[PDB]
Every structure is written in structure tokens, then in C-alpha cells.
Design a protein around this nucleic acid. Structure first.
Ligand SMILES: [Mg+2]
Ligand SMILES: [Mg+2]
Ligand SMILES: [Mg+2]
Ligand SMILES: [Mg+2]
Ligand SMILES: [Zn+2]
Ligand SMILES: [Zn+2]
Lengths: 908, 69, 117, 106
RNA sequence: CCCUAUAACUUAAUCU
RNA sequence: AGAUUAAGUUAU
């Protein structure tokens, strides 16, 4: 107790021992660490300090802690000198150096710290696991974000089933903003005193005070260099999750004051972004361009768009979108868009604007009709209280309420199927796939699911490494620009989007334009931004859940140029076998077997894993979509310049990422996500899927205790992984090759859009060296803003059983001829529901369209190799009904099972 | 049994659709709610209660004649 | 035919584009655009500051009283007098018909059409 | 149209549920609901009655057998919108036609 | 009014 | 054997 009153000091604080006696306490905390013996951002165990909790006058415990560090004596003298240089900075926690008789040993007492550091909050949110979140609950209850009985609500953490958790995390926001301002003050003190050193998150309180001067080196004053790369980069997802800059939208930066009233005509905000970057990120040493048209490469675009998404949360939502001018064509006033203000890319101005023209060609008619400026400026004002999304205009005087009708019942096949014995009580095969009808409020209710899209900042150094590893997965393909006579449009009798669907299908605009007009329009989009309108339609399809599906038809002005930009690379992806992205690979003629044998390739202790993306089209962040389009456009290094590649990226973001959306005769603003009818949507979803998997492996490897890794090679790989992320700003292509080889050896992926099957090493994942399901849950929590429950994931120990689900198909290993192959089979209720319920009354004929049942029996063939007899009777039911229709109509092979056994054997 | 009540709710909502229930929003909402809840049922008593409530919409308007069929 | 239909869609696009500036009146649009520094404004403020007509789609009565109570209301820093209220079947609803007790008899959402004062 | 109505009543005859058969048989004899038959005892049931033989075939006393359910009658209105009491009506009072009955579920 | 994009497969009818 | 057209089916 005589040690306690020396620790109490002159501060007159009532102290209770958090440990026992005079011994050193043991805590378990998260440290960001980089030695020549360990690296990583991991949870370690700290046996360095004695803690003393502070009591109040009514002896309830306070969040003040006295943390007394025992160490060597040279560190004591060194930290005393550094502290005496920095004692008048108000961002420094107050220190008290003394020596005591524990035998004399020196002690460094840090006064009135919090219980947790900033590293503990950042680890709590970036390695989230429900059922193992005690630091996050203690931080939320301590700083009055919520009460303790908030967590008794089940799914309190889920962003989708409980969107009130954003209000709770946003009560940590001013705490994080004060922490940022104290870091800028401490960096200014280090630069004035001449002190060099790395700022680490575990040396900073939640109050914002800094300590642990034991690695700081003195130089001449005025010339201090603070290293803040790992600090800000590991902090960056918390800045948007807790909404730290919301106080910047108030008057004099005070949450008690009102909101700043901006000018409505103001769009620029470049000086305000530069001031925000100077205030919060002053010592971040990479140059920042507020408008990304001034960027130097694609990594600069990613780096600067990541600051723009944070700073665009401060600005009014009416300032973003198409920037609009008045233009006199044929002496006639006119309204066009001459630019765009992107939340991510800043202000883009069109280069080829014509302030005066006498006539309009067919190309500029197409560009002016696709423009939302003339439709929005001619419409009424709209205030839609049904949805939270931003509403622009009502194009007409009515609100359209489109419904979905139910399915049409094919009664002949149903009583033929109950004639054979199907659909009994307690049977294994039932009906679960129906055409669910919808009412007039279904399109806006499905448009309201864009509220899961939140403005999300990324760990930019982690992302800039992951983009090189993900670009390694696309090195085999060949891409580049093609001419308009090399494009291949498959279905020309499809919709052309709004407003072009008033006058024709896509056949009309592909026939009415020349190849030279199409090439001129494509050359126009490499210099100017054309915003377009995406139309939302309700899908009339068969499903198991009553959720209404919407499709997003993109206008022909966007699709025509995006085919010309991307089609070479997309045809190269879809024509490659044996690769990770298996778009284009058929499941027939032994294709499923070859895909599974490619994914199993040479993994050592193999397990299968497959996960889920909850709300993947809606909740995908804008930075990952921009990242995916940059990865796709990395094939255009010879045909396209840098400025042309930027204008193509800006056209993708103004056309399918944050476009204006017509939904029932009314324009709304899309927050982000993927448009379903984009030209490149499956391939961009494949890029996003591989990105999240690579991020999960990076987060698994870096959060592992490097003392416990028994392989020397994996331990040095973890060291260099930390160095390539945070301690190095060039691309280290040798380590990208090495990490990509490590991933191909231990984490083998089969990716088709959102769907994926990995074959992973089990001993490496149990040691935490490749990712597992918990890593994916964490990465989707802080990057994707969704909680992926483990009920929608699957793992698999036996590889003689296939994947559990891939592309709605299950896998069976069956003896075909003299081999054992992997056959895919669907859910038998899906095939029976496609038989029983249709969408057209002429598909109820049966005697017309035998072809329909022939295709369904092709899909339901491998059910005959199943152990369940009721599963195997589905193919024989389809055979007998095909035979019945084919006989009472009036080629006998359609009820011979050899035509269908031919579809699953390798002889194509 | 339950397959029969699901299939006849599909036919019943299709005939309520072609009888222009969709011209009344407040009626078509309840009809699709009953139809979607019949198609999702797990025990047949719930399905038959909702089936009775959905058939009452058909019989409640004079556009049908129950004598002829 | 790739020129008969091409001239046809050219004429239709001409008709649609020349119909649209007849809808707008340039009395407020020119003082919006000339108040800008470089004659360049966001599109999202054009129907907010220029449009002479407002449509309010209201899902239930509790939003209706908090938004469009009375025959005039304030939105977008303007005052709007209610011209009409139609329902989801597009039947005319009187303003005296929207009540707390009468609300389940109405076909929600209501579309309130208002004009700028 | 008529083909779908025909197959609808064909599979309605196959189900052989007593509540559906009760409602279907009631609609031929003129006993037709005025709104949606509810699944809660709160909501009011509005059933037309076309004659007294249908009246005593459908209800006896104050309770009411409809949709294979019991409903106590709360209110009765004859065609000229005069509120008719339950004891007011009998076969001699039946010329004194079709009248609505408002009930609630037992 | 209105029903997207990509990929695979089957059948039929044509030209080599 | 290849291509063109039309219908249809599955997957995302
Ligand atoms: Mg430390
Ligand atoms: Mg230290
Ligand atoms: Mg999903
Ligand atoms: Mg999927
Ligand atoms: Zn830049
Ligand atoms: Zn190019």
C-alpha cells in the first residue's frame, strides 16, 4: 500500500488496486506490432504494467486508470527525456516517473487513462464475432452508446435485422473525432520537438491521449517525422462505421449547433475537402487529389476516392449528380449535363461541350435523350415518403403501381404426377417453388432495400495490396477495345431502357446507327460523361421465398459502349477452362467433374467451404465496385490513354453505380450497388468475390500471433505481408507473386459471381494461416456492412462428397461406366415446380412445347443415381409424361434414358 | 392434401386476377397476402382457414354464378 | 429497313425533346442558372427550385398529418397549396375524408398534388 | 375464363373440406358474404340472408353456423336499412326481402 | 405501360 | 462438321 500512495502522486486520486499488491497485472489486449521477430495486428497478452482504478467520492469506479509500467532503466531515462520534450502538448497523457524498492526498480506511471486503447476498439470492430464480443460490449456500455440490456435483444449486432445498431455505433463518433484531432496535435508536437517515431493505435487512449515514448528517437527540432501510415489505415473503417465526421456538418463544428446551410447551387467543395484533409489527416504523406481526374494511375484513383467517400458524407446530397447547363441548339433553349459530381471521384467536367449548334445528329440525339437532365427538369417535384432514398422528380402526374400476377397451373401434369404416387403426406419430395404474386407496393419496397448500402471507407493500404493479388487472378485473359463491327450482341430483341423503349427494342438502335456512329459514340464516352437512367422492372419468376425480385434494365447508350469496352475481356474470361473464375464452363459433358477436380487441385489436408453474401447486389460498397471496374480495365493499357480510362470509369460510375433510377414513372437516386442489367455484372461480382476472399486471408494471417507460427516460411511471409501493406508504398511484385502462390497452394477457389467453393488446407486454417468462416464474417462485417450468419455457410470434411451447394446444384459421386464422376443434381421440388406451375397459358398446353419437359428431364437426369427412391422417380415421371405427350400429339429417344445419359458423359 | 390446397389457391388467385380484383388495391393486397401465406404453410389447418378467407372474395362478388358450375 | 425506321426514331426523338422545353417555363430556370458562377448547377436542385407542381406519396395517415396537414404546407423552402388527393386506385379523395378513424377505409398510399405559392 | 372457373370448382370439389363446402353450398342458395370472412373474432362478418328457410337453415336463436364456425349474431338490418331485432323476425314477420347479418366469431 | 445483363444447353427450320 | 434464324430450359 506504500507503493499505492506513490502512484497516487500529487493528483489526489482515490486508487484501488486493479491487480493485487505490488505485482504486475496481466491483461489481454490488441496490439499493432512490427519487430524483426513478429509483425501483425493481433491480440497478445501484456504483463508489463500495474493498473490502479480510480474511485469517485461515492466510490463508484471511474474510467480513469493509473497504468504504471515496469521496464528497464535505459528505457526509463529515454522516455523521461522524450516526455520532457513533449510535456506541454495537451494530447500527451500526463506521466509520473519514480523509483521504488521492490527488491530499486524504476516505474513510469501514466495517469487517468481509459481501460481500453484505440487498438481495442479497432480490433473489436474489425475482428467481430458474435458470442465472443466482450470488449465491444464494454466499450459501448462504458461510453453511453447504449444500455447493458440492449444486447439481450437477439441479433442486436445485425446491420439488416437491426438497423438501430448504426445509431449506437454512431455514438462513438465524436470520441473517434476527438481522437483524430489529438493525433494531429501530437504529430505537430513531434514535428516541432524534432522527434521521429511510429504512431501506433495501442499507444492511444479512447480519451485520445498518447503515451509509450519508448521507441521515439530525438533529432534536431523542427525536423520531426511522425510515421502515421498503419495508424490511419487501420483506423479507416471505423471512421465511416461510427460516422466520425458528422460534427463537420454543423455550424462551428459543434453537435449542439444547427446544420450548416449550404448554397443549393454549390457543387464544387474542393476547398472544403482540402480543408477536411488538412484538419484530420495532416501528416498522411501521400498526395491527395480531391477531384480524381488529376490522379496519376489507378492506385491513385483508389487512394483518393477512399478519402472522397469519407468527406462526401459532410456535404449536401443535392450537390451530387449530373451537373447541368443551358444550351442553345437551333436557337432553342435546352438543358444538358456537362459534368458530374461524384461522391467518390469528385467533380468531372465534360470536354466536348457545344454551347451552340444549329442541328442535332443521330448521335447527339441519342446522348441528349439518354440524359436525365431533360426528364428531370421537365418533371414535377416528388416527395416519396415510402422510401428513404433520394427522390428527384415525377416524370408524369401519376404513380404507377405494377403488380405481379400468380402462376398458371398445369393441371394435367399435376394429376399425372399424383397418378404415379407423388405428393403424399410425409413424402420427401414436396412443392416449395411457386410463383408468388405481388401487390402494387412491391417495386418501391424492393427499391427501399438500397438502404443497406452505406458509405464505407476502406483500409486503403490493405486494399491496395489486395488489388494486386486480385489482379494476379486475371492475368491469363486478354482484353482491350474493339471496334463496333467486332461486337456480338446475342439477344437483339430485348428492351433498350428508358426512354428508348418507347420507340423500339435494341434491334432498332443497333440497326439505325452505323458502325461509324457507334464508334463515334464510344469515342465520345472516352472524353465525356453520359449519365443515363436505369429502369426497374418486377420479375415474373418461380422461387421459394415471397420476396419480389426486381431487374434493372440499363439504357442502350450505356450498354452499346460498355460492350465495346469490355467484350474482348469478357469473352476471354468465359472461354477459359481450368481457371478460378468458371463463368462459361458448362456443367454438361463432364464439365462439373473437371471443375471439381480443378478446385481440389493439390490442397494438402483438404476441406471444402462455401459462404454467403447477404444482400450482395444492394450492400456492395462503392469502393469495391470502383476497384472491380479498375481491375477489369487494367487490360486497356495499350489502346486507351490515362484520361480515356478515367472517363470510362466515370461513365461506369455515372451509369450503373450511382445512376438515376426510374421506378414507376419517377426518378430516384441510386445510392450504390450493382445494377442487375449491367453488361459486366457477373464478372465484376466475380472480382468482388475474389477480393473479399483475399482480404479474409490477409486478415487471418496478420491477426495471428507470430510467435506461435511453427513454420518459419509462413512466419516470414506474415512479416513481409505486414511490410508490403503498411511499411512500403511501391508495388512489390515478388511478394505479390509469392502470396498468390501461397493462396493457390492452400486456398483453392472456384468462383461464379457471388457463389464460391474453396478447397482449403485444414491444418493451416486451424492454426489461423488461411481464412475460415469467422474471417469471412469479420471481413463482411467491416467492409460489406452485413452480418453473414454461419447458418447460410457450409463446410465439408469429406471430399468424396462434393460441395454442399454451388449454383443451386448438389453433387453426387457416382460410377459412370468404369469411372467415378461428380454429377450435379438440382432440388427435385425445383424441377417439379417448373413442371406444375408456368407463367404463360400456352405453356399449359403440354402437347405444344414438349421441348420444355425435355429440358427439365435433362436437368433432372442425375436424380436417377440418388439413394432416395422418391428423388429418382422424378426423372422417370418426366420420361413417362414426355412419352404420353409425344404419343397423344400424333423421336422415341425422349423416353429412352440414353439421350439424357449422353449429356453427362465426357464425349461431347 | 396440402399440395391440393396450394394448387387450388394458385388457380383461385389466377381467377380473381382475371376478374379484375387488381382494379381495387385494398382488395388485391389482401388476396395476395392470403395466396402467399397459403403457399408458405406447413400445417394444413392454417392453409384451409386462409383458403376459406380467400374463396370468400370470389363468392362475395356477383361476377360468378355458383349454380352453373 | 434501316433508314425508314431510322428517320422514324429520329423524328420521334425530335418530337420528345421538343415537347419537353414546352413543358418547362424558362422564367425561373434562367435566374437559377445565371445565379451560378459558371452557369452550371446540380440537376437535383432543378425540380426543387423551379417546378410548379409537387407530388407527395404518403404511405399512411401518421405521415400525412406530419407532412401535409392543412390545405397548405411547407416543403423545399416553399409553400404549397393542395390541389388534389388521389388514392392508390387513382380515385379522388376529399381532404375532409382523410381522418384518423376513416384511414382504413382509404386505399393507401395517397398522392397529394400541390402547387407552388 | 370459364375453363379456369370450371377447373377451380373441379379441384374445389376434390378437396372435400366442410367449411369450403358450406360456403360453396350457401352461395347457391343466396347466402353470400358482403366482405372477406375473417380469421379473428374482432372483425365483423356481413352475410346476406335471402329467405327464412335459409335463415333457420343458417342460424338458430342468437348463434350462427357459418364457414364451419360459430358466430354470435350482434346486429341485423333489413333491405330498407331499418335495424331489425332478433326477436322481431319469424316466418310471419318475414313478409313484413334479403337482409344482412353482422356477426362476430365465437 | 412494362419485362435487364451474362453464360450454358435442347429442339426445329435454313445455308455451306 | 460448322454457321444463321426461331422457340424453349437452367444458372447468376
Ligand atoms: Mg505500446
Ligand atoms: Mg514502447
Ligand atoms: Mg444471396
Ligand atoms: Mg448465390
Ligand atoms: Zn490521386
Ligand atoms: Zn481500350
Amino acid at each position: 500500500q506504500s507503493f499505492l500512495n506513490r502512484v497516487c502522486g500529487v493528483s489526489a486520486a482515490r486508487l484501488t488496486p486493479c491487480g493485487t499488491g505490488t505485482s504486475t497485472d496481466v491483461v489481454y489486449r490488441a496490439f499493432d506490432i512490427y519487430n524483426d521477430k513478429v509483425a501483425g495486428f493481433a491480440k497478445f497478452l501484456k504483463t508489463n504494467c500495474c493498473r490502479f482504478q480510480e474511485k469517485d467520492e461515492d466510490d463508484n469506479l471511474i474510467d480513469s486508470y493509473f497504468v504504471v509500467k515496469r521496464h528497464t532503466f535505459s528505457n526509463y531515462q529515454h522516455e523521461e527525456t522524450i516526455y520532457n520534450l513533449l510535456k506541454d502538448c495537451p494530447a500527451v497523457a500526463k506521466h509520473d516517473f519514480f523509483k521504488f524498492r521492490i527488491d530499486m526498480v524504476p516505474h513510469i506511471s501514466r495517469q487517468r487513462l481509459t481501460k481500453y486503447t484505440m487498438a481495442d476498439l479497432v480490433y473489436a470492430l474489425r475482428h467481430f464475432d458474435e458470442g465472443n464480443c466482450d470488449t465491444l460490449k464494454e466499450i459501448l456500455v462504458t461510453y453511453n452508446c447504449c444500455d447493458d440490456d440492449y444486447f439481450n435483444k437477439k441479433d442486436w449486432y445485425d446491420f439488416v435485422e437491426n438497423p438501430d445498431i448504426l445509431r449506437v455505433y454512431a455514438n462513438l463518433g465524436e470520441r473517434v473525432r476527438q481522437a483524430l484531432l489529438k493525433t494531429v496535435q501530437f504529430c505537430d508536437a513531434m514535428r516541432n520537438a524534432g522527434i521521429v517515431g511510429v504512431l501506433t493505435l495501442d499507444n492511444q487512449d479512447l480519451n485520445g491521449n498518447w503515451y509509450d515514448f519508448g521507441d521515439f528517437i530525438q533529432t534536431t527540432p523542427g525536423s520531426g517525422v511522425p510515421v502515421v501510415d498503419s495508424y490511419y489505415s487501420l483506423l479507416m473503417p471505423i471512421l465511416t462505421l461510427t460516422r466520425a465526421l458528422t460534427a463537420e456538418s454543423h455550424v462551428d463544428t459543434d453537435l449542439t449547433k444547427p446544420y450548416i446551410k449550404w448554397d443549393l447551387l454549390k457543387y464544387d467543395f474542393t476547398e472544403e475537402r482540402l480543408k477536411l484533409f488538412d484538419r484530420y489527416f495532416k501528416y498522411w504523406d501521400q498526395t491527395y487529389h480531391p477531384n480524381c481526374v488529376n490522379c496519376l494511375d489507378d492506385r491513385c484513383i483508389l487512394h483518393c476516392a477512399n478519402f472522397n467517400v469519407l468527406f462526401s458524407t459532410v456535404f449536401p446530397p443535392t450537390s451530387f449528380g449530373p451537373l447541368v447547363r443551358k444550351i442553345f441548339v437551333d436557337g432553342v433553349p435546352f438543358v444538358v449535363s456537362t459534368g458530374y459530381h461524384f461522391r467518390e471521384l469528385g467533380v468531372v467536367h465534360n470536354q466536348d461541350v457545344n454551347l451552340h449548334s444549329s442541328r442535332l445528329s443521330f448521335k447527339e440525339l441519342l446522348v441528349y435523350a439518354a440524359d436525365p437532365a431533360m426528364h428531370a427538369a421537365s418533371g414535377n417535384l416528388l416527395l416519396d415518403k415510402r422510401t428513404t432514398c433520394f427522390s428527384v422528380a415525377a416524370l408524369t402526374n401519376n404513380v404507377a403501381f405494377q403488380t405481379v400476377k400468380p402462376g398458371n397451373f398445369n393441371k394435367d401434369f399435376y394429376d399425372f404426377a399424383v397418378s404415379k404416387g407423388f405428393f403424399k403426406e410425409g413424402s420427401s419430395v414436396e412443392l416449395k417453388h411457386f410463383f408468388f404474386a405481388q401487390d402494387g407496393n412491391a417495386a418501391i419496397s424492393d427499391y427501399d432495400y438500397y438502404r443497406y448500402n452505406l458509405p464505407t471507407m476502406c483500409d486503403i493500404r490493405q486494399l491496395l495490396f489486395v488489388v494486386e493479388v486480385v489482379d494476379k487472378y486475371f492475368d491469363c485473359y486478354d482484353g482491350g477495345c474493339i471496334n463496333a463491327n467486332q461486337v456480338i450482341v446475342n439477344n437483339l430483341d430485348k428492351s433498350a431502357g428508358f426512354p428508348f423503349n418507347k420507340w423500339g427494342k435494341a434491334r432498332l438502335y443497333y440497326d439505325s446507327m452505323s458502325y461509324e456512329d457507334q464508334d463515334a459514340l464510344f469515342a465520345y464516352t472516352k472524353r465525356n460523361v453520359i449519365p443515363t437512367i436505369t429502369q426497374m422492372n418486377l420479375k415474373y419468376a418461380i422461387s421459394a421465398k415471397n420476396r419480389a425480385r426486381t431487374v434493372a434494365g440499363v439504357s442502350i447508350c450505356s450498354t452499346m459502349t460498355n460492350r465495346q469496352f469490355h467484350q474482348k475481356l469478357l469473352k476471354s474470361i468465359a472461354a477459359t477452362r481450368g481457371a478460378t473464375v468458371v463463368i462459361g464452363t458448362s456443367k454438361f459433358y463432364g464439365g462439373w467433374h473437371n471443375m471439381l477436380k480443378t478446385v481440389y487441385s493439390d490442397v494438402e489436408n483438404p476441406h471444402l467451404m462455401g459462404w454467403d453474401y447477404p444482400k450482395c447486389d444492394r450492400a456492395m460498397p462503392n469502393m469495391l465496385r470502383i476497384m472491380a471496374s479498375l481491375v477489369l480495365a487494367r487490360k486497356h493499357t495499350t489502346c486507351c490513354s490515362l484520361s480515356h480510362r478515367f472517363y470510362r470509369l466515370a461513365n461506369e460510375c455515372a451509369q450503373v453505380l450511382s445512376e438515376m433510377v426510374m421506378c414507376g414513372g419517377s426518378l430516384y437516386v441510386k445510392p450504390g450497388g450493382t445494377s442487375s442489367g449491367d453488361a459486366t455484372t457477373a464478372y465484376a461480382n466475380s472480382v468482388f468475390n475474389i477480393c473479399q476472399a483475399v482480404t479474409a486471408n490477409v486478415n487471418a494471417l496478420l491477426s495471428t500471433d507470430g510467435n506461435k507460427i511453427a513454420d518459419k516460411y509462413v512466419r516470414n511471409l506474415q512479416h513481409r505481408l505486414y511490410e508490403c501493406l503498411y511499411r512500403n508504398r511501391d508495388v512489390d511484385t515478388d511478394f505479390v507473386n509469392e502470396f498468390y502462390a501461397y493462396l493457390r497452394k492452400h486456398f483453392s477457389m472456384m468462383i461464379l459471381s457471388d457463389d464460391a467453393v474453396v478447397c482449403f488446407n485444414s491444418t493451416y486454417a486451424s492454426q489461423g494461416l488461411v481464412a475460415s468462416i469467422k474471417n469471412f464474417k469479420s471481413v463482411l462485417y467491416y467492409q460489406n456492412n452485413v452480418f453473414m450468419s454461419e447458418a447460410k455457410c457450409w463446410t465439408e470434411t469429406d471430399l468424396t462428397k462434393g460441395p454442399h451447394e454451388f449454383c443451386s446444384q448438389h453433387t453426387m459421386l457416382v460410377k459412370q461406366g468404369d469411372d467415378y464422376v461428380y454429377l450435379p443434381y438440382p432440388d427435385p421440388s425445383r424441377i417439379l415446380g417448373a413442371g406444375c406451375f408456368v407463367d404463360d397459358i400456352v405453356k399449359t398446353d403440354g402437347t405444344l412445347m414438349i421441348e420444355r419437359f425435355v429440358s427439365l428431364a435433362i436437368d433432372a437426369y442425375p436424380l436417377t443415381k440418388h439413394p432416395n427412391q422418391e428423388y429418382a422417380d422424378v426423372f422417370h415421371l418426366y420420361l413417362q409424361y414426355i412419352r404420353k405427350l409425344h404419343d397423344e400429339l400424333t423421336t422415341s429417344r425422349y423416353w429412352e434414358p440414353e439421350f439424357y445419359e449422353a449429356m453427362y458423359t465426357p464425349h461431347t | 392434401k396440402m399440395s391440393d390446397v396450394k394448387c387450388t389457391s394458385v388457380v383461385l388467385l389466377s381467377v380473381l386476377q382475371q376478374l379484375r380484383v387488381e382494379s381495387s388495391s385494398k382488395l388485391w393486397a389482401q388476396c395476395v397476402q392470403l395466396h402467399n401465406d397459403i403457399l408458405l404453410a406447413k400445417d394444413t389447418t392454417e392453409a384451409f382457414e386462409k383458403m376459406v378467407s380467400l374463396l370468400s372474395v370470389l363468392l362475395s362478388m356477383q361476377g360468378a354464378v355458383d349454380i352453373n358450375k | 429497313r434501316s433508314e425508314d425506321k431510322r428517320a422514324k426514331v429520329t423524328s420521334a426523338m425530335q418530337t420528345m425533346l421538343f415537347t419537353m422545353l414546352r413543358k418547362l417555363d424558362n422564367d425561373a430556370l434562367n435566374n437559377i442558372i445565371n445565379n451560378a458562377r459558371d452557369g452550371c448547377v446540380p440537376l437535383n436542385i432543378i425540380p426543387l427550385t423551379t417546378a410548379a407542381k409537387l407530388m407527395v406519396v404518403i404511405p399512411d395517415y401518421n405521415t400525412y398529418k406530419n407532412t401535409c396537414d392543412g390545405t397548405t404546407f411547407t416543403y423545399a423552402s416553399a409553400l404549397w397549396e393542395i390541389q388534389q388527393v388521389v388514392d392508390a386506385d387513382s380515385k379522388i379523395v376529399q381532404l375532409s375524408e382523410i381522418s384518423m378513424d376513416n384511414s382504413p377505409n382509404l386505399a393507401w398510399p395517397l398522392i397529394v398534388t400541390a402547387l407552388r405559392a
